[PDB]
Design a protein around this ligand. Structure first.
Ligand code: TPP
Ligand code: TPP
Ligand code: SF4
Ligand code: SF4
Ligand code: SF4
Ligand code: CA
Ligand code: MG
Ligand code: MG
Lengths: 1231, 117, 235, 59, 118, 58
């Protein structure tokens, strides 16, 4: 049986994968994560595959682990699948060779995503799938959501019969996240197509001790080649098997496919060859242009590997004179990209007609591939015929791009209604849009399409929804650029973004704002918008959604009001029926907490309809007075690069705007001043005790402690209230807590922990603080930071240091950023940061916003994100460089001492050499050398003078989350700590993979709910700390800001100063954990985490052992019995209690028992008199020795693996017995 | 399952070229390193004895029990549990929620009281 | 000078790699193991590179770890190299995109060895090096023991001046283990060919808190494509 | 000895190394079946994935 | 019918014993992350590590299982870091059976470990 | 009358340099690849050489 439904590419694919598989080994990675998660949910819900069984799915430590597990399951006779992309797919490559090598029917489902090179991108292109084209996997592409479902089925059926593994792929986001009304098959239908004989043979040849075989042998030159060629027959049959199943599936669905399909004019003279979602847009353009007589066409590539030239030519019109092959990737240095090269080989081998073949590159990292661009591609074949071009960018550096005329007419089928919705993060717009699609898709014959563009900013971000509805199939795999309906759900956007860009003349524009009266509308609505509305005779509507929502008691949520606006003014359905479904659905959905809630929304609709009246505007609007640029002062880079990007104009920046190596300058976040907080703290000086705790805890550096001399407050504003500084050392200074209202995120942590019962910080509406504080912050900023008054590593003193990571895109109240900001206040000016991919790399470096900055002297954290799996090794490498280069400097210094260098110079050199690894002494003498050697360019002194950036001892740090530290990067972390070198590892433990969507990690606790632990994790939290402490020579410590800011600072100094490896694990609160009362309770939660004994604090210091003292020290106290309330105050635990109360109770009891036993173990460790010793060094000398030197018997075998240049001498190979046995035998054979 | 070091480690090490070769080439360092190994195994055996004599070990509570079904970590949460970025977007995401930009529950409640009007 | 001496492909290559490098992150895998062991033994013996310094070389937990360390050393301004093959090279692929993407003068010396599919093989072919052809590394082949030395040198000199990483490769066993009478250059001669200004510029652009920058950003669809094409002039 | 205790019903996921080399260097296969034709089902995936490989067999 | 399907699955009747074989290089270094994850899974698999305290097959290179003072490639002047304690690290899980054996010392202890671990 | 073109720089692949080494008299050219990419229309070097001739258009 068939079945219609609105769903996305991921779901359409997972629908099939679940049915056709018995086992799945997964690992999360955007944008394929949805598939694995759905598979887990469905298995838990009771969904059965074609064998009537629930899917056996397990999460591994990385994609490499998943690929190995997939290989093992297949080798052992179970139909297996996995979901991956980009960096993940790369880690599977080694096993792919083995899986295809052993002819196993595996199926990988990949959301093709860009590979991280100059930068990382979670978006779609074929860089990843092309990187595995040589692994021996068949490769089958889907170009649309409907095809994602169809090709997924063909892939599984074909893999089973052919014994050649398949990689079914579709474009990341453009297809994986696009919503379409499609048709899916039920599982019984899928099962009916399985080749039972092939399935039986698969089971029979699989590993099993009842009938064993050996696989994975090692082979010499005599037979390897023949062995590699033995599978040829299987690959020769794959194409026919793929065709067989496209046809069998077609007999059930009515949708036919070929290895290569052609669309367009039969006598086309210009043809494009493409693969993926681009094919949909290309066909749309062909329909439009061909109808005007253009002889153009397209060949869609379905089966990329094996590549069958015969099938390619079968789709090629003999009339083709020019052919452009489009590749969605870039292989630097290659004579051409993959598909282009494959096509060239087909023509070369054919040896007949040779049409002009052109290569073109498009869509990297989901770059738009619009109708206008397709037009450029066809025009190019009849025009200049530029080869090896790029389209979608302006390459003003190497001139490879095609010009694009965006004046191209709309090519969507007649009757198609296109909509755009501008919403504010979490305002429910996206949710409403999705419901609208389902409602319309389920109650009409209309096709529906949905695609959402989100913001990089995690809180208060901008989301732009693109929806399309039509009587004809929607092949528009590109953003809406000419809408009939445009809604702005956040009035703030009116004066910051070009929300009316491209809207059709006479189009509908709905705005949510309290500017009902014409006076107010003229007061806020910019002249540009006014002129646009009047000139296009747009049907403008204004609705005070907030007011309507509040009146009906909806608390002010506008989602239901704007939903009504859509159903009434969009025109997709008739008013009557339109309002009908919406209401019927309100009952369908909700209908939970009595009718009280059901009635409010129903009323909201009623009121909205009555309120939605066409705003009547005067004709004078046509030529309203243009405003004037009232923009503040910012960098040249912010003005020319950042600003354009933040205002949705990034696509207009040419190649010349960027650095060849992808680098970005620090501090660009300084000028964003988003101002998205709803409420911000208000300082109440009369109650302030001048403790600086508020600034210490801020997740965005929105609090600036001010300490200035009287003379520095002369030209200070009237309301720039300041107190006389408390403290003996601050005698005479003026103190003030300056709130940065525009960078504040409104989390509330500061006001929450402000000590005085009569709070010195009270949350208030942003609009009541900005007018006064904005100019105040500006003035405060010009006041020199007094970093020399108090100890840098003291609670209060630390906040008198320049924070070097500010205003990041982390969520409001993020539990990670407070820690990092403080670390920079202590070592920022001399640290290197090797950051593992994750939330910290995302809020840390999402272009164009760079929160890390430099101090007044231009010094700042040298930050870098290599990959997710290599953070520790990446940092270790930085450490190796500093060692090699500073040692070089040290040798030069020593030589300089044995020269006629001046007394002062030699004095400084000796000083530096004596304290080169001391942060204080190295800087002291380093600075002297800079002055003394200034201008020196010759000889030894010249070399030393040019190495000034190596003088001061640097601090190498490795930042990463728990997923990195406990799972994927653990092997590297373990090895780096075991090295004994001077590096510092800071782990922000959120007890879950946060960035990717809350997946379980080995750091996740017993009973916590998370993806792949949806019934509460059934294994306890991995004890990373205790595992690392077994080394004895590694500094290990745990911290929790909320419990003790002092202990955290103490740990930072001890860890950093330890002349060896240091590991610091911090408790980081996260929105994924579901804090009941808000993230503004983070500090409180961190505090209770420790007191309850859930997260005990301690320090393991090896140098104490070197001085005869126990290295292990416990910093917290025994469990105070508050664990139960601690857990229930977090939804990650509470949600389980509400769903499975019995299991939940036992699981929470398990946690209490675990922490009880662990604390007692820690106490025993602190009371022990037996501890591992510690020694920094004690040898080195000079020279080396081989392990076989002077050995009595052979120490190496006679194989190729141990052969070395100097090997080959005769030795006793142990084939005559021991020395004693040989001696005894000689005595017995006297003769 | 074994007994305390019997003091024959030096002979054990010197009977293997991987150790003896160092003694022949770098006698001073070797002597130091063999003594270090002796100390390491001494400490380690004592730690193992401590593990065996302890009355505190890692035991587990009854269990969790079978759970027919599952639940999402964000279900019924007071505030948003997911951000508004492409990485956390899911088929069922998009619903309105408190994004923590207005303060904690109590702070918001107090503000309400202080604003009443 | 031109004094003919007998040696194998690996040694001829290591001879050059040691002189032209400051740091090496290694992991053993047949048939490239000899190079890493030679580099480590020479460093222990105090052999000096062209900068008059002993090579800083460490063994990682895998080739993935080695590639990560190479990336970090290069990012932090040290000339770096590694030796690998087959399965090992495959584990270095992710970092290879990063090393070329960031235009770092790294040099990989690879003894081309078969990839394990229907079976494992420690012997020679180009299955491994071709598996990394899209990573953005320049690829320079040696066809003899003499060429192993010569191309190893060209690879290092060119990487330094071009800022594009190089994979210098030669056939596993057939060349890596073949012994031939060839000519190798002394270290002074190799040092004389280095573009010292390019080297200084490499140091100046590297990671350092005295003059920080951000590398490894995450980019949206609005600018990723432009950023990927920005390196064209270098290639 | 391990095979003398569980040989007839065991799967072996072998990491690359000496044990995979003396274990399965073509054409010499030392692992054998008992009188009933039962014996260790042996496999070498890669050097880095032995545990995961065995884990997959278990799944 | 059903009896037919069941009859065709006879090679699945007897409980099997899944073993993972590897050297110290695999267990302590390159395969450690995987070994760690798999043991943490809590599933029924048996891991047997043949510790030669060096990467043997490739030519005697040092591994984290190599002891202090042992000479090996990359430990050309005697290893200067102690042997990694894989055993104690894994015992921290509490739900993993961990044991060490040495045939020459006791064949009986070895046999007891095999029986108990399996 | 036979010859050989030795490939030194495989990447970047410079077609102009390849042609500078090709005798105008060549009627048949065999590209030998020391690899196997199952299902590919051809191995790496062969595909690169084919593209050079297609682009030359002579
Ligand atoms: C090889 C690879 N696999 C998967 C991903 C996708 N990914 C990026 S970060 C991440 C989890 C981050 O978790 P964590 O380390 O805990 O940091 P958090 O975001 O929780 O701070 C995942 C699964 C990737 N980039 N690379
Ligand atoms: C990714 C990868 N890196 C390196 C190698 C080369 N290699 C194979 S086994 C091995 C060491 C084996 O050491 P161990 O695990 O201790 O076993 P032993 O040979 O000592 O029994 C090495 C370095 C490989 N096959 N794959
Ligand atoms: S409310 Fe939050 S973001 Fe704002 S100043 Fe306070 S701690 Fe910082
Ligand atoms: S936390 Fe409160 S008392 Fe302390 S410095 Fe800040 S405003 Fe003042
Ligand atoms: S760690 Fe959690 S709270 Fe912080 S940015 Fe990530 S998702 Fe948001
Ligand atoms: Ca340290
Ligand atoms: Mg985390
Ligand atoms: Mg070993």
């Amino acid at each position: 049986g068939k079945k219609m439904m609105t769903t996305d590419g991921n779901t359409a694919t997972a629908h099939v994968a679940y049915a056709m598989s018995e086992v799945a080994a997964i690992y999360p990675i955007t944008p394929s994560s949805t598939m694995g998660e759905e598979a887990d949910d469905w298995a838990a819900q009771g969904r059965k595959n074609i064998f009537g069984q629930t899917l056996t799915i397990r999460e591994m430590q990385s994609e490499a682990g998943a690929a190995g597990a997939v290989h093992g399951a297949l080798a052992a006779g179970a139909l297996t699948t996995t979901f991956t992309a980009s960096q993940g797919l790369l880690l599977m490559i080694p096993n792919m060779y083995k899986i295809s090598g052993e002819l196993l029917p595996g199926v990988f489902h990949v959301t093709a995503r860009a590979i991280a090179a100059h930068a990382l991108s979670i978006f779609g292109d074929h860089q990843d799938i092309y990187a595995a084209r040589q692994t021996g996997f068949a490769m089958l592409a889907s170009s649309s959501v409907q095809e994602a479902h169809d090709m997924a089925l063909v892939a599984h059926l074909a893999a089973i019969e052919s014994n050649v593994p398949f990689m079914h792929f579709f474009d990341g986001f453009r297809t994986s996240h696009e919503i379409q009304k499609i048709e899916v098959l039920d599982y019984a239908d899928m099962a009916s197509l399985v080749n039972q004989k092939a399935l039986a043979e698969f089971r029979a040849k699989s590993m099993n001790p009842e009938h064993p075989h050996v696989r994975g042998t090692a082979q010499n030159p005599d037979i390897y080649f023949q062995g590699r060629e033995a599978a040829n027959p299987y690959y020769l049959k794959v194409p026919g098997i793929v065709a067989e199943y496209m046809q069998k599936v077609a007999s059930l669905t009515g949708r036919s496919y070929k290895l290569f399909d052609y669309v367009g004019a039969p006598d086309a003279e210009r043809v494009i060859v493409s693969m993926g979602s681009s094919c949909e847009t290309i066909e749309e353009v062909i329909n439009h242009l061909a109808a005007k007589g253009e002889k153009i066409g397209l060949i869609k590539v379905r089966l990329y590997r094996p590549f069958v030239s015969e099938a390619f030519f079968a789709a090629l019109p003999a009339s083709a004179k020019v052919i452009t092959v489009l590749d969605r990737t870039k292989e630097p240095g290659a004579p051409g990209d993959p598909l282009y090269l494959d096509v060239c080989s087909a023509f070369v081998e054919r040896g007949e007609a040779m049409p002009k073949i052109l290569a073109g590159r498009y869509g990297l990292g989901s770059k738009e591939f619009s109708p206008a661009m397709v037009k450029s591609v066809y025009d190019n074949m009849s025009g200049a015929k530029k080869n090896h071009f790029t389209v979608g960018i302006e390459d003003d550096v190497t001139g490879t791009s095609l010009p694009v005329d965006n004046a191209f007419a709309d090519t969507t089928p007649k009757g198609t209604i296109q909509c755009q919705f501008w919403g504010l993060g979490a305002d429910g717009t996206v949710g409403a849009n999705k419901q609208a699609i389902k409602i319309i898709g389920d109650n009409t014959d209309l096709f529906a399409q949905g695609y959402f563009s989100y913001d990089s900013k995690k809180s208060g971000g901008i989301t732009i929804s693109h929806l399309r509805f039509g009587e004809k199939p929607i092949q528009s795999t590109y953003l809406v650029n000419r809408a009939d309906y445009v809604a702005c759900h956040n009035p703030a956007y009116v004066g910051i973004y070009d929300i009316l860009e491209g809207i059709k003349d006479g189009g509908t524009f709905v705005l949510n704002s309290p500017w009902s009266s014409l006076e107010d509308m003229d007061k806020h609505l910019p002249s540009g918008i006014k002129r646009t509305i009047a000139n296009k005779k747009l049907k403008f509507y204004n609705i005070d959604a907030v007011k309507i929502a509040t009146d009906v008691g909806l608390g002010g949520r506008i989602n239901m009001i704007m939903q009504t606006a859509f159903f009434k003014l969009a025109g997709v359905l008739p008013f009557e029926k339109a309002v009908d479904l919406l209401k019927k659905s309100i009952h369908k959905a909700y209908g939970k907490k009595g009718e009280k809630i059901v009635k409010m929304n129903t009323d909201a609709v009623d009121q909205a309809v009555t309120s939605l009246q066409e705003f009547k505007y005067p004709d004078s609007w046509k030529d309203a007075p243009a405003e004037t640029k009232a923009e503040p002062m910012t960098n040249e880079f912010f003005k020319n690069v950042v600003k354009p990007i933040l205002t949705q104009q990034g696509d207009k920046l040419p190649v010349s705007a960027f650095e060849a190596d992808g680098r970005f300058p620090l501090g660009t976040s300084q000028f964003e001043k988003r101002g998205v907080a709803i409420n911000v703290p208000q300082w109440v000086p009369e109650n302030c005790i001048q403790c600086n705790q508020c600034a210490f805890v801020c997740p965005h550096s929105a609090i600036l402690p001010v300490l200035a001399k009287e003379e520095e407050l002369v030209g200070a504003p009237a309301n720039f209230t300041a107190l006389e500084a408390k403290g003996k050392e601050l005698k005479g200074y003026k103190f003030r807590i300056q709130i940065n209202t525009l960078d504040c995120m409104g989390c509330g942590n500061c006001a929450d922990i402000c000590p005085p019962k009569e709070k010195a910080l009270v949350m208030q509406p942003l609009d009541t603080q900005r007018d006064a504080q904005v100019p105040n912050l500006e003035y405060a900023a010009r006041i020199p930071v007094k970093s020399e008054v108090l100890p840098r590593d003291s609670l209060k003193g630390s906040q008198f240091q320049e924070p070097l990571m500010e205003f990041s895109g982390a969520c409001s109240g993020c539990g990670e950023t407070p820690y990092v900001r403080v670390i920079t206040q202590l070592f920022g000016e001399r640290m290197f940061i090797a950051n593992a991919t994750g939330c910290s790399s995302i809020w840390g470096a999402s272009a164009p916003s760079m929160p890390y900055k430099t101090n007044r002297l231009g010094q700042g954290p040298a930050w870098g994100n290599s990959l997710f799996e290599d953070a520790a090794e990446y940092g270790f490498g930085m450490n190796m460089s500093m060692f090699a280069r500073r040692t070089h400097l040290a040798d030069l210094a020593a030589k300089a001492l044995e020269s006629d260098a001046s007394g002062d110079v030699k004095e400084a050199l000796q000083g530096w050499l004596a304290g080169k690894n001391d942060p204080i002494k190295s800087k002291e003498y380093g600075d002297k050398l800079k002055k003394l050697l200034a201008g020196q360019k010759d000889g030894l002194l010249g070399q030393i003078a040019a190495m000034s950036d190596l003088y001061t001892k640097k601090s190498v740090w490795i930042f990463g989350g728990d997923g990195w530290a406990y799972d994927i990067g653990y092997g590297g972390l373990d090895h780096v700590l075991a090295s004994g070198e001077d590096v510092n590892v800071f782990v922000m433990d959120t007890e879950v993979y946060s960035n990717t969507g809350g997946q379980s990690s080995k750091a996740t606790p017993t009973g916590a709910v998370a993806k792949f632990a949806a019934a509460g994790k059934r294994t306890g939290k991995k004890d990373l700390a205790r595992m690392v402490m077994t080394y004895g020579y590694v500094y290990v410590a745990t911290v929790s800001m909320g419990y003790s800011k002092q202990q955290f600072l103490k740990v930072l100094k001890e860890a950093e100063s330890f002349p060896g490896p240091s590991l610091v694990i911090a408790y980081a609160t996260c929105i994924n954990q579901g804090l009941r009362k808000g993230m503004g309770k983070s500090q409180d939660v961190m505090n209770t985490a420790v007191k309850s004994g859930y997260w005990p604090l301690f320090r393991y210091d090896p140098r104490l052992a070197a001085q005869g003292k126990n290295p292990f020290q416990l910093d917290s106290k025994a469990p105070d019995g508050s664990v139960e309330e601690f857990l229930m105050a977090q939804n990650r635990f509470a949600v389980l209690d509400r769903s499975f109360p019995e299991d939940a109770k036992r699981l929470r009891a398990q946690v209490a028992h675990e922490l009880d036993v662990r604390f007692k173990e820690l106490e025993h460790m602190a009371a022990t008199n037996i501890f591992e010793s510690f020694a920094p060094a004690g040898g080195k000398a000079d020279g080396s020795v081989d392990f076989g030197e002077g050995a009595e018997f052979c120490t190496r075998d006679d194989t190729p693996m141990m052969a070395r240049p100097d090997s080959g001498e005769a030795c006793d190979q142990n084939r005559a017995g021991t020395s004693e046995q040989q001696g005894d035998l000689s005595k017995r054979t006297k003769k």
